[PDB]
Design a protein around this ligand. Sequence first.
Ligand SMILES: Nc1nc2c(c(=O)[nH]1)N[C@H]1C(S)=C(S)[C@@H](COP(=O)(O)OP(=O)(O)OC[C@H]3O[C@@H](n4cnc5c(=O)[nH]c(N)nc54)[C@H](O)[C@@H]3O)O[C@H]1N2
Ligand SMILES: Nc1nc2c(c(=O)[nH]1)N[C@H]1C(S)=C(S)[C@@H](COP(=O)(O)OP(=O)(O)OC[C@H]3O[C@@H](n4cnc5c(=O)[nH]c(N)nc54)[C@H](O)[C@@H]3O)O[C@H]1N2
Ligand code: SF4
Ligand code: SF4
Ligand code: SF4
Ligand code: SF4
Ligand code: SF4
Ligand code: SF4
Ligand code: SF4
Ligand code: SF4
Ligand code: SF4
Ligand code: SF4
Ligand SMILES: [Mo+6]
Lengths: 289, 289, 982, 80
Amino acid sequence: AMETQDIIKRSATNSITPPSQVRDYKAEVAKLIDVSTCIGCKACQVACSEWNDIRDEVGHCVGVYDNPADLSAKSWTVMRFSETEQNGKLEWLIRKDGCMHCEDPGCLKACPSAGAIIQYANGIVDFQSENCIGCGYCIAGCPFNIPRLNKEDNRVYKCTLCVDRVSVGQEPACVKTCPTGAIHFGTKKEMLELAEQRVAKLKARGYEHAGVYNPEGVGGTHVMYVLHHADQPELYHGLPKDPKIDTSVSLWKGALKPLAAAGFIATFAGLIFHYIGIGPNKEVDDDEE
Amino acid sequence: AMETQDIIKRSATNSITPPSQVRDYKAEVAKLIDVSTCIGCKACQVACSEWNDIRDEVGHCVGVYDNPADLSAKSWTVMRFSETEQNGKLEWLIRKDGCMHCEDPGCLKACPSAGAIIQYANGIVDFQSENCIGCGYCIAGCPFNIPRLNKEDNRVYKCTLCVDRVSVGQEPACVKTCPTGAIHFGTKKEMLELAEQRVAKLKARGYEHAGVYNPEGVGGTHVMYVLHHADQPELYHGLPKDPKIDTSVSLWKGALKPLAAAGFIATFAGLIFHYIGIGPNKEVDDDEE
Amino acid sequence: QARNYKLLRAKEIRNTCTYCSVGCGLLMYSLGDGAKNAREAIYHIEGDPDHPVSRGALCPKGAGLLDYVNSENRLRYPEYRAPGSDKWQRISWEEAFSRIAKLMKADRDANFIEKNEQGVTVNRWLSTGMLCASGASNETGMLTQKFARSLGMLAVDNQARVXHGPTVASLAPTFGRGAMTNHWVDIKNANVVMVMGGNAAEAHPVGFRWAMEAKNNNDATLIVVDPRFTRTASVADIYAPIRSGTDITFLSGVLRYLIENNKINAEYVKHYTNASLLVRDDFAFEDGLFSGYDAEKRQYDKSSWNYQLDENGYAKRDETLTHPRCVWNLLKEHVSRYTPDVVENICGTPKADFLKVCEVLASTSAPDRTTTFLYALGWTQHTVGAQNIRTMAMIQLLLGNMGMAGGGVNALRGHSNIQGLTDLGLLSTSLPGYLTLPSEKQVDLQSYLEANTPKATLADQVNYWSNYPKFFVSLMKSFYGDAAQKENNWGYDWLPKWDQTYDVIKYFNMMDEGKVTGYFCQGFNPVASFPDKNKVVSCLSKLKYMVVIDPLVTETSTFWQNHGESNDVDPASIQTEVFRLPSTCFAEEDGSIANSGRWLQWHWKGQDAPGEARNDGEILAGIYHHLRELYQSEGGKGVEPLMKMSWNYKQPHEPQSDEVAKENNGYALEDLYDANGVLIAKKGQLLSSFAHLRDDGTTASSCWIYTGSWTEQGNQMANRDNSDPSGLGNTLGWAWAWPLNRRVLYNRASADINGKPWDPKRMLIQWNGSKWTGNDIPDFGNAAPGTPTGPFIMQPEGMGRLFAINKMAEGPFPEHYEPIETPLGTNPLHPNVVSNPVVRLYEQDALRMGKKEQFPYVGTTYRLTEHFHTWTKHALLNAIAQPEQFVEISETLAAAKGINNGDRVTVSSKRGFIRAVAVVTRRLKPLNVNGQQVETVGIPIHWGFEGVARKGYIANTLTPNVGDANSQTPEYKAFLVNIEKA
Amino acid sequence: QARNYKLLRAKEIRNTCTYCSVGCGLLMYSLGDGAKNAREAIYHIEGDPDHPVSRGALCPKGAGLLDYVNSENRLRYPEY
Ligand SMILES: Nc1nc2c(c(=O)[nH]1)N[C@H]1C(S)=C(S)[C@@H](COP(=O)(O)OP(=O)(O)OC[C@H]3O[C@@H](n4cnc5c(=O)[nH]c(N)nc54)[C@H](O)[C@@H]3O)O[C@H]1N2
Ligand SMILES: Nc1nc2c(c(=O)[nH]1)N[C@H]1C(S)=C(S)[C@@H](COP(=O)(O)OP(=O)(O)OC[C@H]3O[C@@H](n4cnc5c(=O)[nH]c(N)nc54)[C@H](O)[C@@H]3O)O[C@H]1N2
Ligand code: SF4
Ligand code: SF4
Ligand code: SF4
Ligand code: SF4
Ligand code: SF4
Ligand code: SF4
Ligand code: SF4
Ligand code: SF4
Ligand code: SF4
Ligand code: SF4
Ligand SMILES: [Mo+6]
């Protein structure tokens, strides 16, 4: 582990023993999904599974185009479809879903196994499966409900941002395949610029609330969206408005630990100093004199 | 370890905590050695050592062409020669020997060190040397007598199926080098087809017992042979007829473990419940009343 | 760290997607470096970033190719199904070849027709027919053409018959050629993109990127007009609904709106169209019928549908456009009935929506603004399919958008190589290069040439089809070589002569009557794709023998096997002998295929085929050489025509793609000299242009429009220069387009009569004082600006036809007629003439038509982006993306029937039924039409009884067996059904 | 995972076996990209798959060329 020496965050690792990260002078990368150019073709689902050597099961049709119906250990990205008349006319809002590669990942923060989840200097958050114990804490820590357990090996999997292509200079498989160029990839700095140009053209077409989805609650994401209705992200099949790491998770993984530590140390001191100070409680301390 | 996330079997790992194997949708590969086209040139021995950066010692001639005389830590494949008149005329049967990359490897089953021996989704069985402890149990577990210990580092080595070439899309070194095309390589499914075509031509030439050697006892192998006399594999310098994992090894690595576990748990319960039930056996339990 | 990059040492091979006609480039990766001891195996496929059209992108079909190449259902060995058997038996290639050749010879010797009842030599064989593979290469196509025709076959069709037949039937008469006029990347120049009659975001997704580029970066307006709110509507600026089968009313309404508001490019219309020509006084139209109608034959006498002739024999003209008989004034009168209220009443399209579309289209009548139309089957698959297209074409001529960058008619082709098989003539009465087989009335060469060589109908025109005899004699030199000479009329009598067209519906009507003995299905699955599946399976069951050639298990190959409700047949009652021969797929051979933009692209082999699969040309050659050897030793009927066909390949059992590609390009058979005595080509050399083809036996070419594709400079179909010097997205160095690398047809119209560009930011061609030059190759000769030479060079009058003279079966102007099964049971424009009056409807099919009292809803069939026909359900990746059959219905209809979203339903028509999951959505909504509420039930066509997706029912179990009046293309897009809870 | 592929960034040079007259094609790999400061050193040799006669194959003599090129008995200086 740590061969790349650019590991900026590592699950379940004390803050005074940080992971190897001397080679951290690298630009942050990012995927930009412009849902206003998406045609819901599912090419990205296909390219992702082909590249990653995974195949989900042949499922069922239950009344919608969406399929598979959810992310899974064998489906790292899925198209989510929404039909709505909330904005005054019929609209078909289609959004690619999958890991957001958060700057401050909740999966990593909730994980109790050292090295199971890491964050590279370029922004990719990836699972190091040799260390995963199958507890599922990351599923609850994630604000986006991303991690999925594989029943065949008790480990969680998700979109890796094609770390195996990006690490050697190539863009991810779904980015390259996208028919309409709804998906773009590059440095984060230039994807934020493309995002702002696209927002400007959407406003010029009448979408006064177009915007970039790059949530500040998680420190910004390396997978960002351009949304026609950025004031109403929940219209896009439940994308969270102002996501953040849950307060209960923050307190559980944060202050509870040192507090418990102090209790335990203090308790041990007290009991030890108590036994020594007062001495045993035997049947007769009195016929000892 | 587990970076490739396609590890289908791993030595000394409990069956309820399987190794990472989500990326298992990959075709099985296989080497096919057609001994009827082999000219005993030893190119494969040379190409294997050149590619793998290993050199055995300069040995001796003891009356046969065979050399080195056996597989070793520095010789991962060796040509074995047999002169016979068992089929009615003089025949020189020459066979390339080395790991068979069994579907159900006995080395892996006998190994007591976690992760020392692994099986990839494509069929390659490989040694992960950081975990090897030099016990040699794999030498006895192997039905083909393949593993060899290196006296300079106390670890076992054998043919890796050129996992370092195959993993990136190239055929193994001995396969490419073979002068006459006796050695073929591809997916297992297409090597079984080539095997059956070659058998058909050998039968047409008079070898009524030609056949493919892909032993069902070990679940089939990823290194297979086309033999002129498939009814008499022992003619080819002792290739085993109907190999399987030895019965003693199966029982030692199988049922003995849980049985011992039950004994130990049961024994501990018994002794603990016995001490508590009856109480100590002191000099006088009687003047206690 | 991360797993290593899995392709670092793989063999990388260039190829082209095998599914639709966008032609996306691929980069395929094989395990093995090419050494002889490693058997290559493709294990990953992604896009080629340098391809100009796809730029690395691949839709879910191309991205999932690996699962098709390596499908569990790939065919491995020749298999045979014996009469009344319920199982396949594996046989050898030599047994398949010898059994098929014996069956063929016996049938040909029994039924070959050497002479017709009038004494003419016709050398035709009608009891065995063939379906050809539009997903296979152009070199396979030419071998199939030679095989079929040398045996005398006339029942020879490819998918064009059920697809873009209507386009060719309407675009050729209107502009001179039947192909898509522009090209994919050029759509980015548009100012208005219209997706009507097509669903390009689902049917041509990577090509549609250019429409998104025009919308997003050129500020274009994207409009979708369709009965359904589709994935293309998702991204559209404007969506307007339309009832299936009513496009001609909507489009005729647009013509009336343009004329009435003078939203036309008046100078373009006056010079480049036939607006000013005068029509005969006896031409007329009244109450649904044009002049010349013969009610008993249900055909028109077209004598009056023609121009008045002057003293020199040319069409008479009135440049002022005031004469009552000019085309312009008759067009105005014809479309005056199509007001916005009539559009709303018949189409169901709200007047406000119809107005928005009319206004946006009208804004492109300016010289520097263009509309481009993107369409396919939503317009062709009707009994008025050809007329749908005529109306749109007329709109583009009024707006002045033909010949412009960002304009034209983008008739998006289907299969990867349907454009090449149409170009090679694998259609009943066709020959390669848009040439035609002789009819049985043309008793000699001279008659034949005169019928096919048009005389100019205006002076000073290019009229390029005047060169017909050079193409024909060159074709005969390619086919017969030294056996074709002046003395025997270049072998003229060896070609089969037709008494009629043997289209698929007709030939299945003959099969049902016991007139067909055998059939070949090469890469065509008629059990899934032909209308009225239950009748199809019944007709096939009467065959004595069937030969299927394909890389995959198809429903057609197992038509005799019981699959429950999906295929409820009794194997013991079907006596057909079936041969299933395993072929290669796109990735296992080199060759070329022609995309929708007319680009001939070369591709290379990445692995051998699985098992004992062989290449299509090797399968045809096995059968053919066994057959011709039987004739050599036993004699038989029609011996000469069969034995004179050439098969001049270095290995006759394995013809190579480059040998056939070079024959299609063509060769100089003697040294050739220009009129000044300058050598233009040496004997033995490949020709560099069809301009050098001669009618005297000194040149050969098996496809004249392909001359230039592979010259003395090399394979131009392998050119990989993506340079675009103008910025207009024209890449003349990538692959090679026909004709003569012209990427934008009719490009002389991109400038006005003086040679000045209509839009100076989009110059395609310009006059330099002695020749035309520019950003595209000029689709024109050297006529200087100001001369009378029209820009439509294949037309005898050099103009775009607003009035189609005598070329269309049902009229020189389009007219609304309702589908055969209509939800109204009448036609509100003229209740005396409900449906097309020239439609051919066999009596047996008329009995299988339903009426609205029993089947009240409009049924329409179409595609989903994730699957290609019934082919991609054999690929696991695509089966995961859309696993189970569904049908789409509105919230209103579901509420009426008590169907909840996702419930099972039964969809039926007068011919059969299917069961499926119901997708209930506001994307389908009832329309108000002629006082009724009309509902549509949507039926995707991807599921069936073979494959890895969930088993389903062939959608064609519901569709009617009737087609367009011109090409007989089935009316799959508008029929009547009923739905019940299931 | 497996050791990385050892020739990924080596200089690849075409040559022909030096022993018998079959003339098998070779693909020789040198440490150094050709830059003037790196003194190339051949460290692996295998067959050229595109050669029509050998198609990638090499007998034990051609497959062992590396040990002849780098033999301990290579001559280094003029001796008398
Ligand atoms: N995804 C995918 N791609 C395809 C194919 C495929 O199988 N899958 N097949 C290829 C083939 S062979 C072809 S020819 C093309 C065709 O491609 P298209 O013709 O675009 O595709 P379809 O979905 O058949 O039909 C288009 C639209 O017609 C609408 N429609 C129905 N009836 C009418 C009507 O009468 N008028 C109007 N205006 N619209 C109507 C349907 O709702 C549908 O949205 O696709 C090619 N590309
Ligand atoms: N109801 C309804 N019916 C339709 C239509 C519709 O919209 N509605 N659309 C119609 C149209 S436009 C068409 S094009 C059809 C198509 O319908 P078909 O063309 O019959 O259907 P596919 O499933 O595309 O069949 C193609 C075959 O080619 C095989 N093929 C692949 N490559 C090769 C090769 O190299 N050689 C050989 N020999 N085989 C090869 C594939 O395995 C597949 O079996 O459907 C038509 N039918
Ligand atoms: S590949 Fe692109 S256009 Fe297609 S569904 Fe995914 S994000 Fe959308
Ligand atoms: S499931 Fe794995 S990665 Fe998730 S929190 Fe647990 S050990 Fe960490
Ligand atoms: S979206 Fe979830 S799984 Fe992905 S980085 Fe953020 S917290 Fe982790
Ligand atoms: S970035 Fe890679 S891993 Fe992620 S969805 Fe795209 S193809 Fe899948
Ligand atoms: S390289 Fe080939 S022919 Fe030579 S000894 Fe080895 S298997 Fe036999
Ligand atoms: S010698 Fe190594 S690999 Fe073999 S059994 Fe022992 S620890 Fe396992
Ligand atoms: S032959 Fe032996 S060393 Fe090789 S996989 Fe099989 S058991 Fe293991
Ligand atoms: S497959 Fe590789 S490791 Fe095995 S004998 Fe051949 S060269 Fe040696
Ligand atoms: S199906 Fe069409 S659009 Fe999709 S990848 Fe293939 S050629 Fe391109
Ligand atoms: S590799 Fe062997 S056969 Fe080839 S030239 Fe060298 S010595 Fe001869
Ligand atoms: Mo089609």
